[PDB]
Symmetry: C4
């Protein structure tokens, strides 16, 4: 078929191959770039969703060396106050999301000391987005991350128009139904590869957004060219997320919903669902495990930093049965 | 490899459409299309010619929303003419009707009743008897004829040369179809549309993608690789306007939906190649069709395509694995 | 690696592509060669298993135009009597299985009027199978089908030593655990193709043995080069099979076991299991559906005979996802 | 495509061995193999060095049947020496024992206690510390050393150059392993054996295939593609002789089986990379081993191979799909 441009791989399709190593998981540097001008101690960002990130989550993230993006599902004043709450909790970095044409919101956020603006849309590669980007860059001084995209052409054009970071991901989210409602998407490993191929030569960080299920996925995302990953579902279950708590049967769940779900849209046909995730308690322990798995990954790959990981990493493509071998098999877990 | 292996076939679940630079919003795209070389539709949806899907009410519903319904042939000629008359007496609405091989008298009566298109459908559209029936209709009356079902370039080419005004594609992909297991025969639906489109497009003859549409995203996929429209069965079978009977099983209400090649449908009036099944009741078709149209607009927005013609020009896809598909649907989260 | 000789396809991996057709399913001729000198009206053979084929099953198959192979899990006299019961019921054709070195059994079966001897082994391409074959051919005159094999070299050697039919299948059987226990096998479509590539040069019929689950599988097997197919589990649940009945809940089951199962061997680690299949009633109806399915396949393929089907057939490889589209989906059966 | 992609990795389930012309019966095949450069076994089976699989009882059982057990290191040096002595006090019986990085003193005490082989084991064999430890051992004591775990040509080559007497292959394939999930790291076991044996065989150094053996047929596969032996954990964990404790859950007796990188094994004395699980109780190890050896003989008979060396020369395999896998197992029959 003439329109077939190749096979796309997701996190589950691959495994990273071990390298000769002289570096322990504990010695690895997880320091990375959020945007061309902003640095992070760990490569973790909490999603801009109303069931994931408000001030409490963003303080937690920043204290752990990562960063939180305050969602835009609220008035400008309430969003500015969330930013101020984080800035008033010490010298802590914080970000905030805006939509297309939201120049006024952007200005007010920047006035409030926000470190990065995340200009996000279901379809980053669009005329309205590029215009908003250009308007912001000419009217205020701040780093702008733009998303969401999955192609080299999208990456190249956004960078040409002033993007300080590029957020990658259409379809891989746990609550996303874009692939089913619209039939559109690119498997996340392939999308990071394609965007990194353009972005890295201009020094522009890729944020891998969506579909992180396990700590092993973080390593994979960074290995193929991401500077950081944005995480929703894994954190929505923690104590510091704004979601409500409901007892289903005997276990407690936190609400977690796409920002393109009918409920999130009430507060276009939906491209996200309203779901539940198991409660996980303090985010600190959750994040510790995530950082733990990534250090372990970099130790296996003999990489003392993310930059080194990019030069040293390789992967094998596996089958669904190879996936069976990867997980736990034939043993009941206690 | 084996000598008889002609390559890998892809279905809807095997691919994903790649986003393009877009200057067009979903609300702005034109869904206008051609049903046949002489008949146009405002949206590219057709309801299946099945006795659990399309009679007069469903056809009226379809036409009002800009699509079309094909009245099934599991009824006497007079009953079928009358159903067509119902739709025609309800405004100036377009409507189709199905006929079987050699049913020239039925075709004539349907055309006189003001039917807009005849659908000459068979389980195996690439056959001598079908072609004979086609030639005879085209010589005895003046009307557009859609012929199916086929899955190959040679079949598409032969039908067009003999006067087909539209080509219906699909052997095996239908939800109620067991052709692939009873006969071992079929072609995955993406590959079949591509093969047939590669021939029909230069002739300007529309391809109807028939069967296996489960989600709105499949419509986008089907059109993107060369279909001008899609024909839909199971999705509409559960609606208020379909003719099937309703059964309460446990708590939920179900509607009957059966293949026209199941034992029950063949009794109405060879081993079966369809099953008799049930689908959940979904209420008014308007809300169902609104979603489908909505998802297709979203698709065309992502693809920067203001029209179906542009969609054919601009679209590309990636093939994905089973684990890729798991990432497409909902994962690790319990839906409410 | 260097030992990877390619991808192997089974029935479920492929679909036959429709051809231009001027032949109705009812007009299709199903006549075929069982062996070089024995013909059948339909290409169906009942398996040589103690839960499938004794005289009643063999009479049933022969009346419908196929053939039954009386199993060897009984003393010589008992097997001869089974053969005599079929021959006493008209001119009806019948076959009988023997094992390696079973020359006396062969002689007796032949004297009793058997039409074909099936020299059966787990591993047909072995020195002692060849020696048994050579010994049979020089001491009596009948057609001998030899199996089971899956390679070109096996087929060539057996034919050169006097085989009148070649039986293909290691691993694909419903009750077979050879692939799990020994790690050995070849997917059935690839095995038929490989063996047909040699046998057809010599006019020697291929029997496709094991793994038929639906009538569609029969068409596939014949399409890629088989002259007939041997069937076990499908017939094992019919009233004519020797198996015993057992009520489980509200469903009636017939026992069905591999001849390499623990229970059959005491009638070496086992390579088959003891199982149950659902009771399907009269065998005539079952066979009607199978024949019906094959006629439909040959109608779609414009082939008026198996010979024409070999000439005209072609197939497409499908994915697991493709297979979900083949079966029934999203609709619950009544 | 994607530039960091080194190719498709195959696990045991992805392949099937192809039968060869055979003149050798299963009962006639020789299963004698080299454990290390200087140590031979009667059968190519090793019990895993885990605290729910191998202590003295298991090690004696393995040795009697022609294989060997590796005493785990989750105990003090004295306790470990004592296990080794018990096996040695039970006839002229082979035994191995594991040590970790820098555990030179432990190694010395084990060697003077008469251990036949030292297994220098780490989650990541291809590391500077492992190599240092290896060189240190080879210079201070006379003993065969098996090093692991690795999955690459370069790792295999470097370990051999620094004095390894055997190479243990396996990162991610074990039943209780979560390395592939937690760290995202691993190589499918067939591919890993092939790559490592491509180097090791040139030097005549035995490859041990460790983890992911689920059925006897997997042993055949592992050896066929170049392993000289296989290490097994879960299969032996449910036997009488494993040191794990029993627990009744429901109406079935289970024994505990846990990774040595599970939170409970590390508490026993980093983020965990193994789980704490349960396997069904299976009685005597002798019966279990008989079946395993039985399957391997059957495999070598199908391949016309009278010895493992001949099996390396003669073996070939075909890749299968998950649908081919369906066919391999039992299907459509309810097992009694
Ligand atoms: C309703 C849907 O919502 C989302 C989809 C995906 C991710 C989401 C993340 C957060 C919140 C909402 C999300 C959507 O906006 N869909 C959609 C589809 C196609 C579009 O195409 C365009 C567009 C095309 C050309 N110019 C401007 C916009 N916007 C689009 C929006
Ligand atoms: C029983 C089966 O019914 C159907 C199968 C598939 C789709 C259906 C949709 C609506 C109604 C019935 C359907 C069938 O007609 N099977 C069948 C199979 C092969 C055939 O081959 C020919 C044929 C070949 C050559 N010339 C004329 C007809 N008709 C055939 C019919
Ligand atoms: C126990 C197993 O049984 C069967 C396996 C597969 C199909 C069956 C069908 C009917 C009855 C029993 C069957 C078997 O015989 N396995 C087996 C495995 C390897 C062998 O290798 C040889 C052999 C090798 C070289 N020369 C002669 C025989 N016989 C073998 C038998
Ligand atoms: C906690 C984890 O434990 C295990 C993982 C896999 C297999 C196991 C088998 C038995 C016992 C524990 C196991 C681990 O050690 N992970 C880990 C991950 C990366 C590492 O990288 C290095 C390392 C890198 C460079 N030089 C020395 C060591 N050690 C590492 C350990
Ligand atoms: O409803 C929506 N539809 C599709 N994607 C969404 C929606 N809401 C949020 N997302 C994306 O999904 C990501 C979260 O992915 P997760 O970690 O896999 O749950 C977010 O960071 C957004 O990029
Ligand atoms: O019994 C039959 N066997 C095979 N296909 C059928 C049968 N009856 C209807 N169809 C086809 O299946 C389509 C419906 O597919 P669905 O939308 O996937 O439910 C119809 O438009 C016909 O092309
Ligand atoms: O126990 C056994 N192990 C392996 N194959 C067997 C055994 N018993 C019978 N077979 C084969 O399996 C075929 C039946 O396959 P089925 O039709 O798929 O049930 C028989 O005709 C034999 O070739
Ligand atoms: O906790 C762990 N994480 C990963 N691998 C382990 C762990 N503990 C033991 N292993 C490995 O897994 C093997 C057992 O694999 P199994 O036979 O598939 O159960 C052992 O011999 C070790 O190589």
């Amino acid at each position: 078929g003439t329109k077939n441009i190749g096979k796309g791989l997701t996190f589950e399709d691959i495994l990273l191959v071990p390298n000769y190593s002289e570096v322990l998981p504990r010695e690895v540097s997880l320091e990375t770039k959020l945007t061309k001008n902003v640095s992070l101690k760990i490569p973790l960002i909490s999603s801009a969703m109303d069931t994931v990130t408000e001030h409490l989550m963003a303080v937690g993230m920043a204290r752990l060396g990562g960063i939180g993006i305050i969602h835009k599902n609220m008035d400008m004043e309430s969003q500015v106050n969330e930013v101020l709450k984080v800035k008033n909790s010490g010298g802590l970095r914080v970000g905030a999301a805006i939509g297309v044409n939201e120049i006024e919101r952007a200005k007010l956020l920047v006035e409030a000391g926000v470190d990065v603006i995340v200009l996000d849309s279901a379809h980053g590669h669009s005329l309205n987005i590029i215009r908003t980007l250009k308007e912001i860059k000419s009217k205020m001084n701040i780093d702008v991350i733009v998303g969401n995209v999955v192609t080299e052409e999208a990456t190249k054009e956004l960078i040409e128009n002033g993007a300080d970071g590029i957020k990658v991901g259409i379809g891989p989210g746990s609550i996303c139904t874009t692939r089913i409602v619209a039939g559109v998407g690119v498997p996340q490993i392939t999308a990071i590869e394609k965007c990194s191929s353009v972005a890295s030569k201009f020094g522009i960080p890729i944020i891998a957004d969506g579909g992180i299920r396990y700590s092993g996925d973080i390593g994979k995302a960074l290995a193929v060219g991401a500077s950081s990953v944005m995480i929703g579902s894994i954190l929505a279950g923690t104590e510091e997320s704004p979601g409500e708590k409901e007892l289903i049967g005997d276990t407690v769940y936190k609400y977690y919903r796409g920002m393109g779900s009918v409920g999130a849209m009430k507060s276009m046909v939906p491209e996200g669902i309203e779901g539940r995730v198991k409660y996980k308690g303090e985010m600190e322990g959750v994040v510790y495990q995530l950082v733990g798995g990534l250090r372990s990954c970099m130790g296996y790959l003999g990489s003392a930093s993310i930059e080194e990981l990019w030069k040293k990493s390789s992967y094998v493509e596996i089958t669904t049965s190879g996936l069976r071998e990867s997980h736990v098999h034939d043993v009941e877990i206690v």
